[PDB]
Design a binder for this molecule. Structure first.
Ligand SMILES: Nc1ncnc2c1nc(Br)n2[C@@H]1O[C@H](COP(=O)(O)O)[C@@H](O)[C@H]1O
Ligand SMILES: [Zn+2]
Ligand SMILES: [Zn+2]
Length: 338
């Protein structure tokens, strides 16, 4: 309902043009936010749920959905440069595209599709713009509550679900009790998996699976048991979360400026509070280009090559873009050795 969005017909027409890419990696979520009064997460999520008939399937009225989404989106901090609703919207939409990869056709149930997109939407909700370590080092009440383990990730989950109890926000009201239980389990699993400290083990397990990889006569992947599906789902959301470098350079560069500003912001907070300045959080000693190249080589590329392997040749264009983007940054590195 365009009215809940406060969008007039002219921006609705702009939005319509942007949403033509709803199912494409090339969608520009920045333009989406620009035409939706900066409610990219609710807009994109509504478009996604309509596109996949998830509202009909799970009996979620547009009212309940929009109410919950606008509430959730409002719990993302618009003053946090990277981990805001724009990033959540990007990850939800990226997850939406990844779910429809040829190699995974007919593999996931609707509840699993619902879980993955929900997970993506709430995975960074109420993010303060600082790392778990910063929260730990400052003796944050949040760190004490979660015993220094996956502090933010646990909090993102607690908030995403807690907001279902606000007025007209229970979008899972009509799922059976078993459905809610299963979705909760899967969502918790996928969001906890976004904790970068679990990356290596996620990748390790992911490779170990690409080995026993099974397909059909048409090439479609075969995932018959839960453990395997959830493992693919958790890695999928992780990949979407780490998809910035695989996007058109125009987009990637905007994501990089944001993550760097957020790091510098934390750097400022550490200086303000008399703490030692963390790595990559000092704008006067950080190498943006070197960082990206290093991030891609050791984290992003190793992840996406493995995902591309699992669903080959579906992710080939993504891998090519990733590699082009990496080399572009490697060339932009300030002309050393002098
Ligand atoms: N261009 C980029 N996009 C996403 N994360 C990046 C990044 N460059 C770097 Br360095 N990172 C790091 O990778 C982590 C990924 O976690 P999130 O995507 O959830 O933010 C970031 O928190 C940040 O520490
Ligand atoms: Zn996160
Ligand atoms: Zn994220």
């Amino acid at each position: 309902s365009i009215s809940r969005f406060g969008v007039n017909t002219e921006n609705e027409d702009h939005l319509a043009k942007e949403l033509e890419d709803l199912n494409k990696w090339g969608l520009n979520i920045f333009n989406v936010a620009g035409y939706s009064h900066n409610r990219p997460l609710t807009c994109i999520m509504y478009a996604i749920f309509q596109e996949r008939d998830l509202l009909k399937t799970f009996r979620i009225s547009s009212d309940t959905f929009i109410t919950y989404m606008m509430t959730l989106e409002d719990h993302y901090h618009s003053d946090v440069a990277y981990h805001n609703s724009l990033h959540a919207a990007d990850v939800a939409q990226s997850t939406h595209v990844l779910l429809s990869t040829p190699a995974l056709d007919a593999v996931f149930t609707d509840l699993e599709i619902l879980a993955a997109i929900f997970a993506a939407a709430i995975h960074d909700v109420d993010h303060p713009g600082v790392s778990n370590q910063f929260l730990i080092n400052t003796n944050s009440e949040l760190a004490l509550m979660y015993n220094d383990e996956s502090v933010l990730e646990n909090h993102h989950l607690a908030v995403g679900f807690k907001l279902l109890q606000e007025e007209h926000c229970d979008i899972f009201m009509n799922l059976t009790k078993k459905q809610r239980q299963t979705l909760r389990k899967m969502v918790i699993d996928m969001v906890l998996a976004t904790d970068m400290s679990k990356h290596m083990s996620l990748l390790a397990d992911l490779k170990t699976m690409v080995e026993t990889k099974k397909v059909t006569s048409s090439g479609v992947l075969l995932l018959d048991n839960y453990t395997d599906r959830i493992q693919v789902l958790r890695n999928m959301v992780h990949c979407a979360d780490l998809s910035n470098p695989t996007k058109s350079l125009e987009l990637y560069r905007q994501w990089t400026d944001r993550i760097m500003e957020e790091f510098f912001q934390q750097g400022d907070k550490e200086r303000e509070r008399g703490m030692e300045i963390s790595p990559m959080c000092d704008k006067h000693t950080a190498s943006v280009e070197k960082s990206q190249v290093g991030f891609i080589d050791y984290i992003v590329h190793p992840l996406w090559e493995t995902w591309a392997d699992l669903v080959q040749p579906d992710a080939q264009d993504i891998l090519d873009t990733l590699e082009d983007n990496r080399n572009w940054y490697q060339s932009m590195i300030p002309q050393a050795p002098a």
